[PDB]
Amino acid sequence: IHESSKFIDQQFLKLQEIPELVPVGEMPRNLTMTCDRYLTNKVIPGTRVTIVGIYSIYNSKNGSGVAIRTPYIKILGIQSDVETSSIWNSVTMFTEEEEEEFLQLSRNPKLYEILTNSIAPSIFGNEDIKKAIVCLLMGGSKKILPDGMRLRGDINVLLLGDPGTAKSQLLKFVEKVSPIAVYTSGKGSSAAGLTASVQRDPMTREFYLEGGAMVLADGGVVCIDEFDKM
Amino acid sequence: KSPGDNIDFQTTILSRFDMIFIVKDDHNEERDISIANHVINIHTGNANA
Amino acid sequence: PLRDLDSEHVSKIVRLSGIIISTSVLSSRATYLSIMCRNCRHTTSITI
Amino acid sequence: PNVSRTIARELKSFLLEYTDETGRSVYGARIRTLGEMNSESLEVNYRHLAESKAILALFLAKCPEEMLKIFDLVAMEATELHYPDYARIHSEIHVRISDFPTIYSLRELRESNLSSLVRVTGVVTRRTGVFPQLKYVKFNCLKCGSILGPFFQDSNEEIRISFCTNCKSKGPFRVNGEKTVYRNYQRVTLQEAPGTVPPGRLPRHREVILLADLVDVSKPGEEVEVTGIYKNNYDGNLNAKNGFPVFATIIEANSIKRREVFSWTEEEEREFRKISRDRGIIDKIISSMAPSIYGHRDIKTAVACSLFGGVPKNVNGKHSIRGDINVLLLGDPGTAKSQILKYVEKTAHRAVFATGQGASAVGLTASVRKDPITKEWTLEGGALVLADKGVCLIDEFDKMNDQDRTSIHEAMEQQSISISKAGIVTTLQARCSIIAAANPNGGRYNSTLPLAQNVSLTEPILSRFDILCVVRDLVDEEADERLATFVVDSHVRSSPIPQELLMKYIHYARTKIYPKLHQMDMDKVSRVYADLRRESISTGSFPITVRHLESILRIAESFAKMRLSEFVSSYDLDRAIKVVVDSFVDAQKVSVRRQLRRSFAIY
Amino acid sequence: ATTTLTTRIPTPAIYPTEDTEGNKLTTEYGYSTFIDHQRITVQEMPEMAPAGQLPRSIDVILDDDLVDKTKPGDRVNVVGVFKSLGAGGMNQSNLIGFKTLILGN
Amino acid sequence: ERVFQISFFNLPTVHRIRDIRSEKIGSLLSISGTVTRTSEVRPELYKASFTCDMCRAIVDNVEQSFKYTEPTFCPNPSCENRAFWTLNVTRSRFLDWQKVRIQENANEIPTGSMPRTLDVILRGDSVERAKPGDRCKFTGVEIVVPDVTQLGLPGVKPSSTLDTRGISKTRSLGVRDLTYKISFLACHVISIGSDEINELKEMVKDEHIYDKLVRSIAPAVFGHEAVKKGILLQMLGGVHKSTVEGIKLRGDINICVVGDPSTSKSQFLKYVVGFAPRSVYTSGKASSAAGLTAAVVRDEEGGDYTIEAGALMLADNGICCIDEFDKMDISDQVAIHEAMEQQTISIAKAGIHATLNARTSILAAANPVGGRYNRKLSLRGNLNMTAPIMSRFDLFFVILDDCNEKIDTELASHIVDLHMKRDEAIEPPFSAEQLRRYIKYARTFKPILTKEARSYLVEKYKELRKDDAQGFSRSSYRITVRQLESMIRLSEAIARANCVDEITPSFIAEAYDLLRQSIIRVDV
């Protein structure tokens, strides 16, 4: 009697040994992993995790040995590195003792000259650059005009010169400080594109947005280098 | 004809970037000591840290 | 590490780490079901 | 058969009696060490019990599977009086039969060899599983409130039971996974080694079972010898064989040996300290970097510094400075450029011998891609992920496409490789050093043009290499006196620090030593730089730049690691500055020769 | 299973090729009545999606009416009952759980 | 402890397997062809114990070829069902069993038909006497074997049924389809296709035999002593294991033959494949890496996987005639060069990884970019094969042609004089009847260097390489250490060729002059 019955969600995960440390001679091995109720959807593929679990045994309808079973883990709880990479998830719910001190920081007069002193511990000179980069991370006049023809608030900055002189380095620190920063290059990178790539899902053959820096970086700065090689 | 881009790229650089900064200066004898002695103070003795 | 998993300590609690590759679908399982006999017109309930 | 009672007490008497050298009862050592390490395995020599009573060795050869019923009980019986309640934590002892005489080629195993003990040769390939499977079996029962007690499981076949302790009943029995206990099982492919196959035939291959925690004690691509019992493996799904009833055979492995982990220890570490203080080991280490040629120290000095690397550091949570030293090896194709890094693939740890595209175990790309078995999906990382701590060795660096070039460039640029494919988004650490081998465009070095014009590669991928090593032709009566003799000596015959200490000394340093530099007098680097920097712009076309100065510190500290110093010595820089300037100057046009004299001021 | 929201007792009636009395029969095709069946599979709208992840999709069954008013690639809102029908695993023999779908109203 | 195998051999006739006819089923027959695969030697059940599940009674007397499961009597007649049994794996006989695949002889295929294949099976001590890739002869039984895939073929298929007459009131009707293939079962195998030493000794004692061999290693070709030496030397090895480290070396010799078209360079490859027993020939356009390197058959027919005798795994210990070399692709030439950067070959598919042995020489015929040989270019530019695969060739032979009337009339005569029936125009000093067996005596000779030779050899590499000072006249390619290594492994070839165990430098001077002759002019 389905209309007087109660049901729950469970999920199948696969975990594999991190490819940074595996035998040179062969592929990594992996474990079928399962979880139930509120433990579902807590984790995103490609995050780094520790699982606490029951290493358990089941029978697989293979087609494996003369008499055998397959291992699996029932997750009974999970935790992670605090957030893997940059993910569109973010926190707006700052605490009362943060607004208190951000307001007090706003009431320093030197605040602009403090950030230009702050946004670069190492880099020497190049004030006329760092000053502009401070202006970048703040966005700008996002304007939803009534005809819909909005204008960008963000700003675009180009570094040009002979190598050295931090023209590549200055992006690396920006990828630390800025919310949802992404660091890529011309021609994209290994297994990543610069711009939105579409392809079929190998199973169920569904078109979907695979990825790209401009797609992940929704809501922040994109760092690009070798911009001639597009 | 050539590999990669073409002079057309002269547009997207000047038209679509809100600032372009051109940053080369020429081997000034005191500058390459100033930056060097700062960069030494990076690698160890952590004085900048 | 998975490399050190063994038939030793099967069904103990284990702590291990890796990368999640994939996350499949939120399949649906019961926790209460109510059941009637199609001939006895007789009702029970089961919980898990 | 009750005769086994006679065999048991005979071998019980053997194990405890057997004195052979110095009169010692060596099995007391074999079993106490068995116990205190919680070893499941005893080690047994065929020559010893055969020298005692050959009928044991015959019975073992004829019908080992039944004979091994007796050994494990007797050894546990001896073990339990040696260690009371050892039976609590360990259920039984396996015996590793060893030193078995009749080695066969994997070809000639045939009809009579099965059900008998055999020693066989092959290469380990296709390790699959570590899975559990039954050893102690118990079942639930539905129609009564209690289980079926313990049944042992024979490896070859399943079991069935009717009886129940409360009832005789039809309804199902099912495995009580609340108690059932499992051995370790693995499937291995064994292949005849290439170098022992007669002309034109193909290496026959067999499927091998490893048990009893002998899982994960070999890794594929090494020659392995095993003791085991060969058998026809009837296991169902066999009536489907049309035509003749022809049975798939298997070997079950008792013992497995790698001879035909490496690590630093108290009794060995300290001799490196005294050696590390003995008289200028660096140029003695440069000699042991290449046994097969006379060669030339200018490449070897670069390779040694990559093998020790530098020190990674950060400026309060950011500003990563690369610990890795990267090398480009270049010169006319006839000069040795693959063989030297082929030695590195031996001598290094976590080191990979990558090649672009085919005939390569790793393609220099991080990827998500098929695996056939179960259509399993997993990442294959690039070699730069597989070697994240150590070094990636790239052969024919020029001969690569777009994708397998952007990968290395992204790794050098920022030491982490993106993934954003197949629905997985990750950045993988690629903190790996490089030795790259390349060839000039047209083979001849064409010394009248700069390196960036001689090679096809452009300056910024070329500049991520701090050290460029070059060799040209040598026409004169040196090479034809030396080189021909070292070459012909290699065919005619069919001072350095020994290799095993050398490969041990790199790993002992890197896992311990982080040599600082203290800013008492190091400022002079800026003075020498302030000279050499300015003076190359005026007379030469290409610049010297902070990226070079950066590498001087990180090359100097490598010799401090090789010295095992607490901090950078004032003349570790003197080694490094010569090693940098003879990278830059040799990279220029022949018109550079002025800069040899100008730099000789410090040389 | 798709004509009532409540799990009516199943009635696996047998198509009548013989009369109660035993006579032959013939079929009056078009005095019989028919209805259109369709299922359409809906996946999350890609601009609201937390991009990078895989698509996830569910099966919608349409009775006679709405069959004509969907086509692939259009942005569509559906309302209905997310029934969880059949009895997989717990009946018959063996895992994957119940077949879940929306009755599109 | 007793089993027998019996063979009849030397039957009066050979029947080409295209003329297999079902009128011969179960009869003795004589067959020959090419073995295309072998397979894992396996146990065949033969006599086995069968035990009742109902009582401890057993039977060992067997029904075994097919129907191998159901003896009709239990040694106590009463059972709650008498007919059915279980086997035993412990008390059984077994015999070694093998399948090999045999292919029609390319000398006798029909016009336009493909080289027919059929399956032939081995029992007992005849097992492991077939070898892939070579001519074989057989005798044995014209067996037939059930085949299912003949469903969907035209014509009625005979179906058996159990009758229904004289039993009453007791696929339930009892029916079967009996459709068969025609394999073969062979009892005998041989690898088809005294006063000898009194000839072998007699030739090596004579002073000229080397020069006789040079003008008889390809009797019909006119001139071209250079390539004749090269091929004769190519049939002879050099010590591959010549290292202390426990890594081997490229002891074998590789050759490329080059020149404008209508050179007879292609004839050599036909002569070699006609003469060298471990040789095979490829057009080099019509090829794939998966046909040169061994393929795999994916775990089919209920056995495990099997390896398919690729053309370059075959021609172990010998020559592969790669005609029109340059029309190969990047894929398969790199597959070659990965099989020359190592003697070994490695294969991956389906997770099954195999490393094959290989050790081979290649004889390559190649053509310039425009066919016409550009005298005024280096061989790298003219030949258009990338430097790594242009490396690892001990020599290149280059031919250039023009009217030289004193020769052209002798050549024209040689061509037309050849067209008189089997005439002696190409009569050598001596024929293959001793040449092949002498080469085997030369192979197992394994000769060695000498002190004065090595000390003198070190100066001839200076002499050679000095010619590249003032270079680019009578010089057209770079000289490096591999030319010394080439020169070493030619030293064994002549030492084998002369059957001299311990060489002298005055013979190595002839190999040196061959390396010299191989070089070419360029415009200043």
Ligand SMILES: Nc1ncnc2c1ncn2[C@@H]1O[C@H](COP(=O)(O)OP(=O)(O)O)[C@@H](O)[C@H]1O
């Ligand atoms: N202003 C600077 N302060 C400190 N270090 C610098 C500065 N400019 C360049 N460097 C040095 O340059 C290296 C980074 O090179 P970078 O300029 O980022 O590469 P690219 O030339 O491709 O931009 C660092 O090792 C750093 O020490």
Ligand SMILES: Nc1ncnc2c1ncn2[C@@H]1O[C@H](COP(=O)(O)OP(=O)(O)O)[C@@H](O)[C@H]1O
């Ligand atoms: N001086 C030498 N002594 C001994 N062997 C040498 C010497 N020079 C070159 N070789 C051999 O030649 C080979 C050089 O090949 P390599 O230059 O690496 O190929 P590529 O030019 O295609 O990269 C090495 O394997 C080495 O064994």
Ligand SMILES: Nc1ncnc2c1ncn2[C@@H]1O[C@H](COP(=O)(O)OP(=O)(O)O)[C@@H](O)[C@H]1O
């Ligand atoms: N010296 C020679 N001896 C025998 N045949 C020759 C000779 N020179 C040319 N030929 C002729 O060349 C033909 C062989 O073809 P070939 O010239 O090898 O083609 P390709 O030049 O494309 O390899 C034969 O028909 C033969 O008559």
Ligand SMILES: [Zn+2]
């Ligand atoms: Zn019961």
Ligand SMILES: [Zn+2]
């Ligand atoms: Zn019976």
